[PDB]
Design a protein around this ligand. Structure first.
Ligand SMILES: *[C@@H]1O[C@H](CO)[C@@H](O[C@@H]2O[C@H](CO)[C@@H](O[C@@H]3O[C@H](CO)[C@@H](O)[C@H](O)[C@@H]3O)[C@H](O)[C@H]2NC(C)=O)[C@H](O)[C@H]1NC(C)=O
Ligand SMILES: *[C@@H]1O[C@H](CO)[C@@H](O[C@@H]2O[C@H](CO)[C@@H](O[C@@H]3O[C@H](CO)[C@@H](O)[C@H](O)[C@@H]3O)[C@H](O)[C@H]2NC(C)=O)[C@H](O)[C@H]1NC(C)=O
Ligand SMILES: *[C@@H]1O[C@H](CO)[C@@H](O[C@@H]2O[C@H](CO)[C@@H](O[C@@H]3O[C@H](CO)[C@@H](O)[C@H](O)[C@@H]3O)[C@H](O)[C@H]2NC(C)=O)[C@H](O)[C@H]1NC(C)=O
Ligand SMILES: *[C@@H]1O[C@H](CO)[C@@H](O[C@@H]2O[C@H](CO)[C@@H](O[C@@H]3O[C@H](CO)[C@@H](O)[C@H](O)[C@@H]3O)[C@H](O)[C@H]2NC(C)=O)[C@H](O)[C@H]1NC(C)=O
Ligand SMILES: *[C@@H]1O[C@H](CO)[C@@H](O[C@@H]2O[C@H](CO)[C@@H](O[C@@H]3O[C@H](CO)[C@@H](O)[C@H](O)[C@@H]3O)[C@H](O)[C@H]2NC(C)=O)[C@H](O)[C@H]1NC(C)=O
Ligand SMILES: *[C@@H]1O[C@H](CO)[C@@H](O[C@@H]2O[C@H](CO)[C@@H](O[C@@H]3O[C@H](CO)[C@@H](O)[C@H](O)[C@@H]3O)[C@H](O)[C@H]2NC(C)=O)[C@H](O)[C@H]1NC(C)=O
Ligand SMILES: *[C@@H]1O[C@H](CO)[C@@H](O[C@@H]2O[C@H](CO)[C@@H](O[C@@H]3O[C@H](CO)[C@@H](O)[C@H](O)[C@@H]3O)[C@H](O)[C@H]2NC(C)=O)[C@H](O)[C@H]1NC(C)=O
Ligand SMILES: *[C@@H]1O[C@H](CO)[C@@H](O[C@@H]2O[C@H](CO)[C@@H](O)[C@H](O)[C@H]2NC(C)=O)[C@H](O)[C@H]1NC(C)=O
Ligand SMILES: *[C@@H]1O[C@H](CO)[C@@H](O[C@@H]2O[C@H](CO)[C@@H](O)[C@H](O)[C@H]2NC(C)=O)[C@H](O)[C@H]1NC(C)=O
Ligand SMILES: *[C@@H]1O[C@H](CO)[C@@H](O[C@@H]2O[C@H](CO)[C@@H](O)[C@H](O)[C@H]2NC(C)=O)[C@H](O)[C@H]1NC(C)=O
Ligand SMILES: *[C@@H]1O[C@H](CO)[C@@H](O[C@@H]2O[C@H](CO)[C@@H](O)[C@H](O)[C@H]2NC(C)=O)[C@H](O)[C@H]1NC(C)=O
Ligand SMILES: *[C@@H]1O[C@H](CO)[C@@H](O[C@@H]2O[C@H](CO)[C@@H](O)[C@H](O)[C@H]2NC(C)=O)[C@H](O)[C@H]1NC(C)=O
Ligand SMILES: *[C@@H]1O[C@H](CO)[C@@H](O[C@@H]2O[C@H](CO)[C@@H](O)[C@H](O)[C@H]2NC(C)=O)[C@H](O)[C@H]1NC(C)=O
Ligand SMILES: *[C@@H]1O[C@H](CO)[C@@H](O[C@@H]2O[C@H](CO)[C@@H](O)[C@H](O)[C@H]2NC(C)=O)[C@H](O)[C@H]1NC(C)=O
Ligand SMILES: *[C@@H]1O[C@H](CO)[C@@H](O)[C@H](O)[C@H]1NC(C)=O
Ligand SMILES: *[C@@H]1O[C@H](CO)[C@@H](O)[C@H](O)[C@H]1NC(C)=O
Ligand SMILES: *[C@@H]1O[C@H](CO)[C@@H](O)[C@H](O)[C@H]1NC(C)=O
Ligand SMILES: *[C@@H]1O[C@H](CO)[C@@H](O)[C@H](O)[C@H]1NC(C)=O
Ligand SMILES: *[C@@H]1O[C@H](CO)[C@@H](O)[C@H](O)[C@H]1NC(C)=O
Ligand SMILES: *[C@@H]1O[C@H](CO)[C@@H](O)[C@H](O)[C@H]1NC(C)=O
Ligand SMILES: *[C@@H]1O[C@H](CO)[C@@H](O)[C@H](O)[C@H]1NC(C)=O
Ligand SMILES: *[C@@H]1O[C@H](CO)[C@@H](O)[C@H](O)[C@H]1NC(C)=O
Lengths: 486, 487, 486
């Protein structure tokens, strides 16, 4: 035979993967990678973030100084983990705007407390209760000071505490709501008391409401917790005629990246930057389906449980070229040559075109994988109580956010996959045209991805075509003689 | 040395449509479809959602038990429709945080009420008023209990009601603000009263303010409405020495997909999943411009009133010529096809396979644009009757931010999709041309206008063999090479 | 000698610019434009928006009528600019909902005040203080009326003011908190006063708290500011037994595009639609990095400090064609021809293909640049105090928004640049194919972007190829003779 065949082709695999594009919902590619993190280890890694396990204590109980929370005194955290088993074991209390106090302490990230010498002359300090046992002693919240009558007298208190420092001061104080009038008059001589806590710019007044309350841990009395922030150069001024649960000092309030999370996941010895209530998750992938509640450098939450990014070309199950099919038998390259000549048949991968496609697919992998982590503060996203307007707005904000990011994730994968298909198809065409330019007038396109070479073309000659060193002039006379005969 | 011409082309229409792409603001295509729902029937369909027309009653008036709202007792709804003509015809009242009470009742979706036996020994029950007529006699809110003196005595009430069930209880109660001291002392012996309603985790104390308020429906007194939710295992405790408007029981409070909408649109007999204050709208399209207030499975609201998605190729208005120059208005039975000119005359034939390939891809993207579409969650309020400050600004800002982002998404999506449709329909034309040139081998030359000069005798059957893909170039190669390569 | 060479090419520049695409993080193009506004002039332009410089006055002090703010009476604004140097110099006061009042007045855009004749029979009007000097005399807030005892009597007030107009009325009023019981009884006979301000649909009751507050400008007393909006057809009813700081009328409350901004930037005589606290910025570009706080028609805020949009093709620094190289020596076009023939060598730009590429790039420039400005009202985005739940939600919404727009901006530039690279490559190939179709059998593709023309091809013949009027039949006999020799 005075001719040879040179076919251009691409590889194929027996186990393709379905992905989505702009055109079709399901197209098979040779390989893909998952972009949605859907699994967790189940453990909260104690590195690199400072994790603080609240165990039996809520953050507020550790703030007030519930006795079984004494170990939390002056503690700091990057992430405070509140357990569902936590409980209160001191004086029954409520906190108006509980969520806001819990949030502002959590964000501050410290329970550092500085005692201050308040001048409570005329009243008895450190009132206790059998409902707040600390060891063998009736006691009280470690950071609050229960004031009451001294010598059957409760003089009007007018006590000041200036902030001469360079930091903000967080003062926690309260008001005692006795259950009976006798109880009211025994502790505070008057049948009713008043508290005004003021600064240069603010004032807070609260009236105790004597009366029976539903029984909670052996009492029908209550304490209401309030807070006051005193800026540097401002002054705390306390006026009371009874029922004041006084502060023993202030908490340092700092600005930082700390937060709080509800979780029953065990704390483990490992390292992971992203934390969810289900446990830590890796943050290599750009999206995650584990939990919309996150802490740290985290993939963005989406509704999809899987989004596959194509990392290879379309998978397509005498000799023939790429127009017909792909080559499962080609394992050492993505594109290559098959030939038939006087020496038989052969196959060789084209490394340069293979690397050009691989470099682009790895290129888009870096862009899709590095424009990734959400890294700012998080509102609450789960609610135990029905609250109306503001809770509705929080849910609406989070739902709007998730739908937009789910849309972004869906579009990104479809656009990226369409481009991956296009670029891998383009490399095939570029190799074919490159080969056709080499052959000049010595070959004809058979239309199936193969060239009919109109001269004797041994393996070294075929190698020169794969080489880019084929000299068409050497064979032109023979080839034109074979092509243009009658 | 006879020859023939075979031209490749695509169709064109006289009435094209302008669409947008990544490049141009206006490019004419053969066909397009609208993606923004911009019209409504004006009618609220009563299916498949349970619609409840409030008619003359607000949701709160039906909750409290205004006499002309008695027909709303124990009713449920998926969507409560409040009319602008609604009015109150009972005791003048106000509700601190009205919007929150209205919202949580609306979301619960039921006015189911369970009477309970409270112990009001020592006081007179069921106080009435002439401004709240029921039938012929002075009456009051059906679900509220006006307590006052018994035998010139109002003992300190200390009444309990445990929650021993497995669901939450919503208690509606109130406080009477008399206009004069005589009124205060006649009904409630002391010159001032107190109310404390508490649970294990909450307590609410409110002080009546005796005095005249502006005249409303014949009275200068007021009732202030409050509410309390009691969890299972918790206990309601009521302590009062006067002015208490007592509850007669609790409302069931549920968690579900119910809501409330202000609208004057009539309710109709039809079926439609998306409801807006303008009426029901179809939800086939991905976007809508009718109203940012929606209920049900609805297209997403965008600022654009039209977004046209290309569903055909670019529209482009004696020898024959191919696709390079123009399109073929005379081709009606296909999108791509052939024209030939040979010894037997001229002819035209559509290529069915390549036409379907284009249509299949365009229908493919039509599905993707339409299937990832409906918003399916709860909606905050988006219109406001009073100017309120911080929280209302944030609600408006959230909604404005959302709409701008979805408007951007819709604009980009249509421009990308249209660019791809133009590109794929152009590609099908080029692939059909390349497919033909591969068949002809050395028997033809590209004339540069979308046509081939075939350098051999090429009768109608021979032309048909090229369109059919069965043309054998070897049969004609000798004749063709002789015609091509002469001096 | 009896042949010619015709090469197809595109231009190149020595100083390319790096942009991003879908594939690579850094690809050099001939030209690009910046999409992120990152600089400000430092000046707030007084046009075309009505700027009102508060100078020494906060908006609230101008509202109440602090004497050194008398010049702001009845003033209007599009944007009120509050300075950090502002101060109060009247009676010490607080506003329980300061931020909300400041916001609704700012949004209304006017301090227009309508005096009304209230019936204060039985009390003395226009109470003053030495802490609020107007000229040289004890005075008070210009818009408030300090009522107190007349003839050692303070009768119970029951005063009405109906709204019979067609607009809403904003009433600003207050309550006096005396520091001692002596002040309380001297001004108001009773040891305590009560105020109820009501309408058909609302009622507000407030109790003074007698007692010492921290020293502010020589006094320990306070005024608490409250407000009431009265709709058309509604009625204001004021009931007082002491301590009432009465309104002298109402402020007009309008609905419009006005707002308030904190800034120390100087106000300028210039024109700029977009204002930031750093100063006015141009709004030609679609995005900006200057400040998330904006007023007017503004580019959207993004985290990126630069986003470069390609406005030219990839930059690729005898004769050869585009397969190898770009042509830095081609300055008058984007694509063109280089030839070698019997009359010498030459270069010519192809205007049609250059304009086709430029028109597509200018076309996408309009779409990227014209659909751009945010044109609605803005929440607060910086906070002086630590506040809890609602502030967290405000921060979270703004952070969510900025990340979404930052993502949109990144994806848009990557897609646009990929398409710009692709469309400019396509124009080069289309020009090459157009030339190849013209030449028919008279030339062969040399594989480097050049044609070998197998006939004598003078300057006029080359011109006919570039003009699209080359007649291949004229030269086909000569060309076939040179090509097909054996
Ligand atoms: C329910 O709430 C009311 C309101 O706080 C509570 O009222 C208190 O009732 C006691 C009697 O039970 C009053 O004490 C009496 O005052 C007179 C005044 O002279 C005195 O002579 C009597 O010996 C007795 O001390 C008390 O003043 C009153 N407190 C207020 C603020 O009005 C009531 O106790 C609550 N009941 C329950 C069961 O919670
Ligand atoms: C006003 O009404 C409430 C409603 O009952 C009264 O509260 C009740 O007070 C008694 C004790 O005074 C509580 O009984 C306790 O029950 C536990 C359960 O085992 C038991 O261990 C204690 O030894 C004691 O028996 C009862 O729980 C409590 N009810 C609620 C709902 O908390 C209140 O005392 C009345 N106050 C008056 C009349 O002043
Ligand atoms: C404005 O609101 C005030 C605050 O409630 C109302 O004050 C009430 O005024 C009446 C007399 O004007 C007081 O009643 C009198 O009490 C004395 C006490 O010795 C008695 O001797 C008289 O026979 C008469 O009953 C009433 O106590 C007082 N309310 C309170 C809580 O102190 C006033 O009525 C309102 N004015 C309006 C709406 O015009
Ligand atoms: C405190 O002042 C208010 C208002 O200055 C007094 O309320 C007024 O009471 C009169 C008495 O009926 C109301 O008269 C009504 O006039 C309309 C006119 O159309 C008429 O249709 C009614 O049948 C009735 O006669 C008047 O509307 C009402 N004003 C308001 C704003 O509600 C109040 O009586 C004073 N309180 C004391 C204790 O003096
Ligand atoms: C502004 O408020 C004052 C006080 O609330 C109103 O003045 C009061 O007007 C009534 C009727 O004009 C007076 O009643 C008269 O009392 C005299 C005895 O002094 C009696 O001889 C008459 O037959 C009549 O009953 C009332 O005394 C008077 N009170 C005061 C303190 O002057 C005044 O009408 C209000 N202004 C307007 C425009 O409504
Ligand atoms: C702290 O705040 C309380 C109220 O929030 C202020 O209470 C007031 O205390 C004075 C005593 O300095 C009381 O005045 C006295 O009343 C007796 C009894 O009639 C009288 O005989 C005396 O001549 C003297 O006037 C005043 O009633 C009381 N206020 C109230 C509303 O009851 C206290 O002054 C504040 N202390 C400081 C240092 O700011
Ligand atoms: C309740 O306690 C407060 C806080 O200790 C007392 O306020 C203080 O009152 C004194 C008396 O005038 C103020 O002294 C003044 O200081 C200024 C600033 O240098 C000075 O220029 C004056 O000549 C005068 O000496 C002091 O500033 C003030 N402190 C605060 C924080 O307000 C108040 O006196 C007590 N209440 C009663 C009724 O005594
Ligand atoms: C399928 O594609 C993935 C992603 O490109 C390949 O996984 C990468 O493999 C290289 C070298 O083996 C690593 O350096 C990358 O970190 C891997 N990336 C990811 C996301 O895993 C994988 O090798 C391909 N072939 C398969 C899975 O058979
Ligand atoms: C991670 O944990 C959360 C809750 O801690 C899981 O969310 C619940 O999933 C169950 C699965 O049946 C649902 O029934 C609940 O309605 C979900 N609750 C909430 C509040 O979302 C979540 O499924 C976990 N992630 C997993 C298992 O991948
Ligand atoms: C809604 O309320 C209006 C106002 O009361 C009702 O219209 C009145 O209806 C009664 C009874 O038919 C007539 O006697 C009155 O003459 C009507 N007045 C006016 C001004 O129209 C209306 O019927 C109510 N409709 C419903 C469904 O409750
Ligand atoms: C549906 O009704 C709404 C109002 O319920 C219309 O929206 C308002 O229409 C008026 C009339 O032009 C405008 O002045 C308002 O500015 C519109 N408000 C908003 C938020 O858009 C809306 O145009 C109606 N749609 C149809 C199709 O009738
Ligand atoms: C690089 O591209 C920019 C943008 O296309 C060119 O700047 C434009 O120049 C025209 C004509 O002078 C102006 O009408 C446009 O307003 C300009 N646009 C922008 C965004 O500045 C610039 O000339 C190009 N540079 C080179 C060297 O070609
Ligand atoms: C803003 O207020 C400050 C402080 O009152 C002013 O500074 C005073 O300026 C005037 C002349 O400009 C002098 O009479 C005073 O001696 C300055 N210092 C003081 C009073 O401590 C400033 O001028 C005011 N600026 C404006 C624009 O009103
Ligand atoms: C515009 O002004 C803001 C604040 O006045 C600048 O942001 C601050 O920049 C400094 C560095 O100069 C940082 O230390 C602060 O932390 C920044 N604060 C905030 C809130 O961002 C901003 O850089 C200015 N931008 C321009 C273009 O002038
Ligand atoms: C197919 O199987 C091989 C080994 O059997 C594996 O390496 C490859 O990842 C698989 N392909 C895909 C797309 O998972
Ligand atoms: C938590 O409380 C339970 C029940 O009182 C107790 O058995 C357990 O030891 C506590 N754990 C810690 C860490 O305090
Ligand atoms: C505390 O205040 C009293 C005034 O009641 C004062 O006499 C005393 O010096 C102050 N300091 C003390 C007791 O250390
Ligand atoms: C291919 O090229 C190499 C050098 O690039 C040469 O050594 C070899 O002989 C050529 N022919 C083949 C490999 O058939
Ligand atoms: C235009 O497109 C729509 C939707 O793709 C299709 O239903 C309709 O039949 C098309 N019309 C023509 C004339 O092609
Ligand atoms: C209601 O409460 C009163 C309180 O004095 C009590 O005497 C009476 O027995 C109670 N009635 C019933 C039916 O339980
Ligand atoms: C294709 O169609 C033409 C016309 O009917 C005919 O000449 C030819 O043999 C057909 N070949 C097929 C269907 O394989
Ligand atoms: C096109 O330009 C060539 C350059 O020489 C010229 O020969 C020819 O006449 C021109 N034709 C037209 C139509 O401009």
């Amino acid at each position: 035979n005075s001719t040879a065949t040179l076919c251009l082709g691409h590889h194929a695999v027996p186990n393709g993967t379905l992905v989505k594009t702009i055109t079709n919902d399901q197209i098979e590619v040779t390989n893909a990678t998952e972009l949605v993190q859907s699994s967790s280890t189940g453990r909260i890694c104690d590195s690199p973030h400072r994790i603080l396990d609240g165990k039996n204590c809520t953050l507020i109980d550790a703030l007030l100084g519930d006795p079984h929370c004494d170990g939390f005194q002056n503690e700091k955290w990057d992430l405070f983990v509140e357990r569902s088993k936590a409980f209160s074991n001191c004086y029954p209390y409520d906190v108006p705007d509980y969520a806001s106090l819990r949030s502002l302490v959590a964000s501050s990230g410290t329970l550092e407390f500085i005692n201050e010498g308040f001048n409570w002359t005329g009243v008895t300090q450190s009132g206790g209760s059998y409902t707040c046992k600390r060891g063998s002693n009736n006691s009280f919240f470690s950071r609050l000071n229960w004031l009451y009558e001294s010598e059957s007298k409760y003089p009007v208190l007018n006590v000041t505490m200036p902030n001469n420092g360079k930091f903000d001061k967080l003062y926690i104080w309260g008001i005692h709501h006795p259950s009976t009038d006798k109880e009211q008059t025994n502790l505070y001589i008057r049948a009713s008391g008043r508290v005004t806590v003021s600064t240069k710019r603010s004032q807070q007044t609260v009236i105790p409401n004597i009366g029976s309350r539903p029984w909670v841990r052996g009492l029908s009395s209550r304490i209401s917790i309030y807070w006051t922030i005193v800026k540097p150069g401002d002054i705390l001024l306390i006026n009371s005629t009874g029922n004041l649960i006084a502060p023993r000092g202030y908490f340092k309030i700092r600005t930082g990246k700390s937060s709080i999370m509800r979780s029953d996941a065990p704390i483990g010895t490992c390292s992971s930057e992203c934390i969810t209530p289900n446990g830590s998750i890796p943050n290599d992938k750009p999206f995650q389906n584990v939990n919309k509640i996150t802490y740290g450098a985290c993939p963005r939450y989406v509704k999809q449980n899987t989004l596959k990014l194509a990392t290879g070309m379309r998978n397509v199950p005498a000799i023939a070229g790429f127009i017909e099919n792909g080559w499962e038998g080609m394992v050492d390259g993505w594109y290559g040559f098959r030939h038939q000549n006087s020496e038989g048949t052969g196959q060789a991968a084209d490394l340069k075109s293979t690397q050009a496609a691989i470099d682009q697919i790895n290129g888009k992998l870096n862009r899709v994988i590095e424009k990734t982590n959400e890294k700012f503060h998080q509102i609450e996203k789960e609610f135990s109580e029905v609250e109306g307007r503001i809770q509705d707005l929080e849910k609406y904000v989070e739902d709007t956010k998730i739908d937009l990011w789910s849309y972004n994730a869906e579009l990104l994968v479809a656009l990226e996959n369409q481009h991956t298909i296009d670029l891998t198809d383009s490399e095939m065409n570029k190799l074919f045209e490159k080969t056709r330019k080499q052959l000049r007038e010595n070959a004809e396109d058979m239309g199936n991805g193969c060239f009919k070479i109109y001269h004797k073309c041994d393996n070294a000659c075929i190698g020169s075509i794969r080489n880019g060193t084929y000299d068409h002039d050497v064979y032109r006379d023979e080839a034109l003689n074979n092509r243009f005969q009658i």
